Amino acid sequence: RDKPAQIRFSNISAAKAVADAIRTSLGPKGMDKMIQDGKGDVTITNDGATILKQMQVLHPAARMLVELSKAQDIEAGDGTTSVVIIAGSLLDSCTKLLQKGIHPTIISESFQKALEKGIEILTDMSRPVELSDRETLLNSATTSLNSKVVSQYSSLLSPMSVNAVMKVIDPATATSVDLRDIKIVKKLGGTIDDCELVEGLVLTQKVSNSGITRVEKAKIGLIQFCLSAPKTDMDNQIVVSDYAQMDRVLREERAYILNLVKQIKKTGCNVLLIQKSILRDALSDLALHFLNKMKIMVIKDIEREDIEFICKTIGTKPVAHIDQFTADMLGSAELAEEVNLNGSGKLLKITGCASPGKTVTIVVRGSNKLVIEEAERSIHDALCVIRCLVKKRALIAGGGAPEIELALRLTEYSRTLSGMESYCVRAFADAMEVIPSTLAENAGLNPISTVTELRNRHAQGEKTAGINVRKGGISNILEELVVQPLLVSVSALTLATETVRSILKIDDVVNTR
Template sequence: MDGKSLLKCDVTITNDGATILKQMQVLHPAAKMLVELSKAQDIEAGDGTTSVVVIAGALLDACSKLLQKGIHPTIISESFQKAVDKGVEVLTSMSRPVQLSDRDTLLNSATTSLCSKVVSQYSSLLAPMSVDAVMRVIDPATATGVDLQDIKIIKKLGGTIDDCELVDGLVLTQRVANTGTTRVEKAKIGLIQFCLSPPKTDMDNQIVISDYAQMDRVLREERAYILNLVKQIKKAGCNVLLIQKSILRDALSDLALHFLNKMKIMVVKDIEREDIEFICKTIGTKPIAHIDHFTPEMLGTAELAEEVNLDGSGKLIKITGCSSPGKTVSIVVRGSNKLVIEEAERSIHDALCVIRCLVKKRALIAGGGAPEIELAVRLAEYSRTLGGMEAYCVRAYGDALEVIPSTLAENAGLNPISTVTELRNRHAQGDKVAGINVRKGGISNILEELVVQPLLVSISALTLATETVRSILKIDDVCFTRKYRKSTETTRA
């Protein structure tokens, strides 16, 4: 189901659990813990943000029933810890190793993640794009993780999702400042953090000009000052100039732009501060804080820098063919409106996180509710080896996990009770990969249907949900502070 969140007159259309919970106005402390739980799952695995909250809710419901039977919270908490330890063992035994060189397996994992999204019909385009993006920023032989900061997602309004593309280089949404030079081959790129404009006095001082001769002299000095800056830039061999955005004064004056245009230097201004690190890593340049440091050694090089027209829906600047690339890529996300673009970005982020999970823990398990049913069956067997109330609690823990296949069956239009019962029987007979096939509307070998997910996603969801439930279980009472009461009253008003 797609959720709609209304906040400050902004509409968000998404079925990403973490996004929906983030937008919700939550007041109760326990509910806030569940929001933080979803956020933690998003950070750790990037996927399974809805499942982790559903599991936590089912476990809390099981805790409520156990407490009503008079079982002490400490016993429930310790039993749940034993259950999750056993659950991790079961999940690990169910998994199968995966090699990063196996592109088809990586594509299946990314496609499974995208199939539940609003943009699922574009999974054949977005899944390969996500896999290629991750594989270009890591060394598959030695990588133990993926820094998603090395993958820049650029949102550009216009076109359709079919127009999304992966660029092996740098993409900027800014426009070329000078109209004369919009394409440069064999580019030598400089990134400056100082202004190409006349110097100004500080806030406490001012200059008073009393006659025209002095005014003319000031203008000549400003012209000579700016011309000297531009000549030094040209002398270093720079033909593409990136200028960091300045909030104190104009980063680029009209006179400086005129001189740069005369010298055939392509100029891009208003580069954001947070993009500096990515730009430097991509094109191999270094940020230059003063004109005295503007030397050829500080420049980055690329085969081509050009401003590209996007069929009347705007322009982008692409810098490709970097001679010393720093293992970074850019993904350009297109869409007909802001809502589609934002959902496409979230979907790509989830797919990237799934591949990152496989890099961190190179193992896959079946999807479609198969792991949860297998856990329920195996934990029921494990509970028979325990005694007393522990056995009862572990059994309740396993039964609570059936909420995932039950919800999947309901969403697929199946009867939840009969579907879960049949799944239990199949798994009890040793069919570990029997799961719910949403496309065909029945139960099948889920691995043959290529519905797979990273082992890390399931382990993370199980452990994080259990930790949160154990934390809530040990809370005796909730005391509201004055500040909390005041904020609650303000919100209700």
């Protein structure tokens, strides 16, 4: 009906309309925003990338957008804006086709036909670089890092990401070193220079107090047993109508736990990961006080995250009641280490831990969290670009100019396809050229000159050459010091090839009731 017709167009309406002003992409371009929200606010906003993740846009075709943005991050670590900058690119071509009247499902597989050959033309413009190679790993991450918020510390950050990978990497060629493997662990204090690359499992948790075990022979594990005592796990018959009945159980409570924490340290435990479960207590506050007397690293109701890494990295198993002693199913740990640097932060480091050949823990330090997070975000794209090299071997360009390099080509590929899709894919095949101008777009006056000529420049640079979007001027973008692993950009097509095609499917609307 008209609803299926309009709602697609209405979906094409919203999502496309968002993706346009979603392109100032990168640059020092366009004026800063407070945001007064839909239900109201004042939200001072910057950097559309995070803004994309921040973006709440609520509309049937708007929700796929925030998704689309977030995926290219987890897909690459880069191109977060880039998947959306080609999203509205797809969102246009559909119209002229549906304006030509072409069937949307016939338009649908055209996206595949666009995605199918598009990645190969990308694979053609891909300059393959070694995924295990220190230099390619350094250099590719360096382009991200030099573009990241710390280009200085990048020099220290890249080999960390290079070594984080090469440890975690499968030897020689690998699709490996996930962001799950890598455990990025902040540490208050230290320095970005003191950001530490640990091959092993460092759990970011804050160790109880200090002066506890830094020594060797840890036993770390998530222990779901609790420390019994009177008025803890143990039965009492005594209701308190009096003050003495209140005190008596306590005198027996703290003493019996004090002898339970021994059994824990008797087990050989320089750490425990306490079950988030309690009865009245589980491990009491005095208990931890008693466990720490025995130099057992304790964090009460430990964060569920470090629970998994120790079970993921070390293979930790449930442990028997401390009155049953233990199963020694605490994971294998030869070091319980609490590091304090800048005199700040409590960081459990389990080294000598059972490790697959993976799970690097990059310890991120700095004089401030903001100091911490700069490199932490920077080393991430150092990790991810390298990880993008690992997952896929190439160096293409960044910035979206090689999209125009696919565009001149994929046009003709349609022209060779000679189908109705040759009109469908081609309508987009050129429409992908839009981004380099729309990056530039949102700032000033006297607009026009650069916009049209950009795609023209590369078009005059033909297939082999074109204008660098970041550095300007016509030179082949693939190797510039504007570069990406091809994994970055190809996923942007994939992600957008589909969620956009998903709109072509929508006929009318429903609301689950």
